[PDB]
């Protein structure tokens, strides 16, 4: 039940990781390269990067306790994505749809 939520948790990336979402799904794979892009203000304005690389590796690593412990890191990898670009940026776009699937889904775990 605990397990199963979590085993709930692992498809909800399997959803967020496959083909038919990767065209909004790409910039939330791994986590921002800082160096390539010279971003060197992001470490300043997002003080917890997460992205779902992170999170596959920490359900992985069994560093969650339950869904709601998974689920707080997935909306900390949005919220990053609206605190740190500008509001009409591609990205904040993609974020939204992204996190449209993740809640559908994750409202949807059985209990
Ligand atoms: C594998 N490469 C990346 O993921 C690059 N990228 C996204 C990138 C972008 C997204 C949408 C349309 C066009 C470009 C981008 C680059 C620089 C600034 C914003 C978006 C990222 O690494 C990336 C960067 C930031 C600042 C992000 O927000 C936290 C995210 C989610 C990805």
Request: aromatic share 12%; hydrophobic share 40%.
């Amino acid at each position: 039940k605990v397990s199963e939520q979590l085993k709930c948790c692992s498809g909800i990336l399997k959803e967020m990781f496959a083909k038919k979402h990767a065209a909004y799904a790409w910039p939330f794979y791994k986590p921002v390269d800082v160096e390539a892009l010279g971003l060197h203000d992001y470490c300043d304005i997002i003080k917890h990067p997460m992205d779902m690389s992170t999170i596959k590796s920490k359900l992985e690593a069994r560093e969650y306790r339950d869904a709601q412990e998974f689920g707080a890191d997935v909306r900390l990898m949005f919220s990053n994505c609206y605190k740190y670009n500008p509001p009409d940026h591609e990205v904040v776009a993609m974020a939204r749809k992204l996190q449209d699937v993740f809640e559908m889904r994750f409202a949807k775990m059985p209990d």
